[PDB]
Every structure is written in structure tokens, then in C-alpha cells.
Design a protein around this ligand. Structure first.
Ligand SMILES: *CC(=O)c1cc(C)n(NC(=O)c2n[nH]c(=O)c3ccccc23)c1C
Ligand SMILES: *CC(=O)c1cc(C)n(NC(=O)c2n[nH]c(=O)c3ccccc23)c1C
Lengths: 304, 304
């Protein structure tokens, strides 16, 4: 028993991290097969940051200007191209450690592991959620750009995120592996509105089920609610409206615990209206929304 | 910027995980050089659990009874011995993926990453603290025994923990890699008192410094305290007494932020006496104690 904010084992991704240097800038790249993917802002100087013309900046660069290093060995760049906000550096050697992989676009509310890297070297791994407003709250210092987000299913790594930006508010923004930003963000040093965020209701309910499974049950009550009534409370507390699709996704947890989804909603309604009263659930004093229903089932079943 | 509960990259440890089966029991082993380490309770049947005589149980076992599998390949066991609560299975092949490593005994209050495994296969990685009462609050289902705790310094893995037990209270207990339990625990299925736990004061202060560094400053006040006065409050709130050694360890964070350690203690005193008032610090509604001062400096400096 016990329930932790667990990241995927990072070994398969560690073997793909390389350092990319262009001019004075150094950040991380992801080496899969004979291609290295990295944020296109590696070609920017400090005078370019405010409003870079990436097309013009990239025209001044040649293959030999992109220094790609995997550990202590240099990779030979034989092509370069920009796809949206990412650069794809074709190299003459396929990464011998390329795992089975996919590039996927995750939905807001879904979770993934980030392998924080600096100079192509991994520093740590943590689990987070793609917020409903398409930002992430990560841990990214200078040099961490190009660090990637991923999920693992058996032996296949689905890369979903590449780190590009820290907004002036301190929240993080990035792209899928085809270089498309999640959210309205642009790779420019400008003030950018992230937009209203909400709490991921279905994940809070999943985590309440994980709490019951792991012995924390004080919040269970004698009440029930309806989707309509629950959603009036969700509206007041800036929670995503719960849909039947969310109820269906919570089905396996409801079956395992014997607690109807709407009964768990009634517990969540009471916690929203009355707070925790100084108590904790799974070591947290707030309602946790970074565990999907799949994350709860996976951790409660020991999937490897 | 940003601050997350970050685990070490787990790749070096993933390459050491193997499955150990003895009779009907399956758990994890750690393969380093030509030795596989695992909990000695792998030799127990359900009738042995309550009070096993490990010496007698092990005498009934031969090398060929310990099935050690690394992925799909079987390892040949050429010796076995029990050291405290661990078994050391000598195999005929050195693990080609053995990283540089050390076996260390961590102190209570220190942190480490756990690579949760089942059937020798990694499922996830998370960071936790060795509680002052020598328990850990992990995520360990049946089959997770033999999963290890570790820290990484550059390319050297210091293994500090091996998982052995879940007490009837749901907290976890285990050993160093020489098989010595942390705390008073024994590898028997009996009710075992864990003893009074405390909050790791120096880690809470470190995390308050991480909060200031990362922009969360609402808890800073116009007050100061002394070690004596702070410790009277720490006593009341079940916090470890703060010593000059703890103040010295917080020195670099105090220097970086310009906030004297005793001034940060005064903020901590006010938070203990008055609570959070519905506010959060680094996304937490409680005072976090699972980041050491070294963890804060490491994450704030991007050490790889
Ligand atoms: C996230 C990350 O690693 C990141 C963000 C930004 C803006 N950069 N680039 C720089 O910091 C940077 N870019 N171009 C230059 O010419 C620089 C000169 C000096 C220092 C930093 C520079 C990165 C890497
Ligand atoms: C932590 C862990 O992986 C763990 C804890 C305990 C007690 N075990 N062993 C068993 O569950 C177990 N041990 N011996 C047997 O003869 C068993 C028979 C059936 C099911 C489980 C058994 C492990 C592995």
C-alpha cells in the first residue's frame, strides 16, 4: 500500500539526451534514430529574444554550426530543418539506445514525467500535469530547454512535451515533438496571457479513490449528488465540469471500492465547501489533481 | 524557476534490477558485479511469516533453488549467504551494466529516490525521506520487496535502502544494503511499534528558502527568534529541535537569499502557530519536510 507522485523510470529517455550548442547558446536535444530534436530558440542571441524572425536566423546557420554532443562523443550533423518551433538535426549515426517510441499530443488534464536536463545531462525526474490552460508547473532553470515530457507503456516511450519557455509569471510552456505549442504561447520573450486555469475534477476524484484504497477514508460521507448539482459547485470553485465520460473513466475505481462516482462527488462537494479542517488526505492538505484515473489504477496495480 | 519533488534519474539503477524467485515467492534483487542482493524473506512461505527461523529456512535451500532472472536471461547462482536481513546470491556473470556504486547508511531526515519494481521490472520512481523514526512512507505493493533507495553523485550511485516490510499501520520499513534494518524493525509478520515521529525542521526551513528563491514570499515577516525560543515552539509542534549544525547547513541558502536563518525560523514559528490561512507555498498547503538543504541547493543550481 501507499500512494506517491510517481514518475516513469527515466532510463529509456536518459539514453536519448544530447547537448545542442549553436553560437553561445546551449540546451538539450532528443536523439531518436538519426534525428536530434531541440527548441528552435537555440539559434537566438539575446538581441533576438524579444521578436525573433526564426526563418532569417536559421538561414544564417549551417549544419556545422549545430554542435551536438552525446556524452563525450560528437555527432556529425548532415541536415537541419525547422518544423513549427522545433529544429530537426539529421545526424549521420542512429542513436543505438533509441527505444520504441511515439510522438503524441497529450490532452489537457493528462499527466507525464519530465526528465529535467542541463547540458544534455539528466538532473532529475518528476511527474506533472498538463494544466487545463496548457501550461505546466515544472522545475526548469536556464539550460533546461529541450528537456522532454513522456509516458511509458511497457517498452514504448510516448514523448508528449519538449520544454521551451518560462512565462514572466513563472509557469512553463512548451511543444509537442512536432514543435506545436500547447496553448496560445509563442517562442518570444514577451508577456503572454496563459488564461484561466481550472482544477482537473476527474483527477481529484481519482485521487480520492486512491485515498480510500490506501486507507484514508475520513472524507466519506452519507451524501450523494447529481452531475448537475456537483457542476454548480465545480463552477463556484473553478473546477472543470464533470461529464459522463469522466464518470465512465472512473468506473473501474468505483467498481473496486464499491463507492458510486456521484457519492465520491458528494465527498468532493463537502471538501470544497468546508475545506479539510486541518486534516490531510494521502499526505496532502489540498485536493490533488495531478493523478489521472489511469495513474491511480496503474500505481494501485503495480504495472511495469 | 519552479520547484518540484524530484527523484534522481533512474537509468543506472534500472540496469541492476533482477527478479528473484524462491519456491512460490517472487521479489526484486539488485545485481551489482557478480552478486545479487535481495530480502532474505524471499525464502519464507506463508506459514513462516509470523516467526521465521531464517537460519533453518536457508539451510533447506540450495543455489539452484534461487531463480534469478535479468530480463529474459537466467543467471546462474554459484553461492548464497545471508548477511543480516539480506541474501547475497553470487552469480557466475558480473552485471555488465554495473554503475560506479557505494553502499551507504543514510541518516534519518535525509532523502533518497526509490525505484519501485515488480518482477524485476521498474514501475516508477519517487523521492522520499527517511523519517526521524526510521520508517518511510512509500508506495509498495506485493512483489515490490527488494526495490531500492538511492542517491546519485555525478556517476556514482549510493544505495541506501532496500525494501522489506509494510507494518500493519501501512508505513514502510527496510534495510541498508548490508541487511541492517533502519529502526527497531524485524522481518517478521508481527505488530511493531514505529515510535514517535517528528517533522524534519531543517528540511522545512530549506523548503521555505526554496519558496523565497522561487517567488513565494507571503510568509516572510518582520520578526526574528532565537534557537531556544524556536525550539520551545518546535517542541509544542512535534518538530525536531534545531541545532547550530542545522543552521550551518542552511548557511548557503541564507547567503543566497539574504534571509538570516533565525529570521526564517521566525517565519516558520508564525506558520506553526497560525497555520497557512488557506494559502499555499510551492503548491503545498502544509509545511513540506522532504527536501534537504542539499536537495534545495541542487535543484536551484541544476546539478546533473
Ligand atoms: C530553457 C532554456 O534552456 C533556455 C531559455 C533561453 C532563453 N535560453 N537561451 C539563453 O539563455 C541564451 N540564448 N542566447 C544567447 O545568445 C545567450 C547568451 C548568454 C546567455 C544565455 C543566452 C535557454 C538556453
Ligand atoms: C514486499 C514484497 O514484495 C513481499 C512481502 C511479502 C510478505 N512477500 N512474500 C509473499 O507475499 C509470499 N511469500 N511467501 C509465500 O509462500 C507466498 C505464497 C503466496 C503468495 C505470496 C507469498 C513479498 C513478495
Amino acid at each position: 500500500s501507499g500512494f506517491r507522485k510517481m514518475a516513469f523510470p527515466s532510463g529509456k529517455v536518459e539514453g536519448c539526451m544530447v547537448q545542442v550548442t549553436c553560437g553561445t547558446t546551449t540546451l538539450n536535444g532528443l536523439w531518436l534514430d538519426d534525428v536530434v530534436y531541440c527548441p528552435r530558440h537555440v539559434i537566438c542571441t539575446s538581441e533576438d529574444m524579444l521578436n525573433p524572425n526564426y526563418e532569417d536566423l536559421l538561414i544564417r546557420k549551417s549544419n556545422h554550426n549545430f554542435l551536438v554532443q552525446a556524452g563525450n562523443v560528437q555527432l556529425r550533423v548532415i541536415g537541419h530543418s525547422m518544423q513549427n518551433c522545433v529544429l530537426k538535426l539529421k545526424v549521420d549515426t542512429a542513436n543505438p539506445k533509441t527505444p520504441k517510441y511515439k510522438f503524441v499530443r497529450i490532452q489537457p488534464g493528462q499527466t507525464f514525467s519530465v526528465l529535467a536536463c542541463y547540458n544534455g545531462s539528466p538532473s532529475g525526474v518528476y511527474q506533472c500535469a498538463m494544466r487545463p490552460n496548457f501550461t505546466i508547473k515544472g522545475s526548469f532553470l536556464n539550460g533546461s530547454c529541450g528537456s522532454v515530457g513522456f509516458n511509458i507503456d511497457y517498452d514504448c516511450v510516448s514523448f508528449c512535451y519538449m520544454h521551451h519557455m518560462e512565462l514572466p509569471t513563472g509557469v512553463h510552456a512548451g511543444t509537442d515533438l512536432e514543435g506545436n505549442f500547447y496553448g496560445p504561447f509563442v517562442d518570444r520573450q514577451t508577456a503572454q496571457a496563459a488564461g484561466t486555469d481550472t482544477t482537473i475534477t476527474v483527477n481529484v476524484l481519482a485521487w480520492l479513490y486512491a485515498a480510500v484504497i490506501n486507507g484514508d477514508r475520513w472524507f466519506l460521507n452519507r451524501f450523494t449528488t447529481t452531475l448537475n448539482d456537483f457542476n454548480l459547485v465545480a463552477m463556484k470553485y473553478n473546477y472543470e465540469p464533470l461529464t459522463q465520460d469522466h464518470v465512465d473513466i472512473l468506473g473501474p475505481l468505483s467498481a473496486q471500492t464499491g463507492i458510486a462516482v456521484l457519492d465520491m462527488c458528494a465527498s468532493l462537494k463537502e471538501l470544497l465547501q468546508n475545506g479539510m479542517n486541518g486534516r490531510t488526505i494521502l499526505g496532502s492538505a489540498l485536493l490533488e489533481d495531478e493523478f489521472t484515473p489511469f495513474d491511480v489504477v496503474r500505481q494501485c496495480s503495480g504495472v511495469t
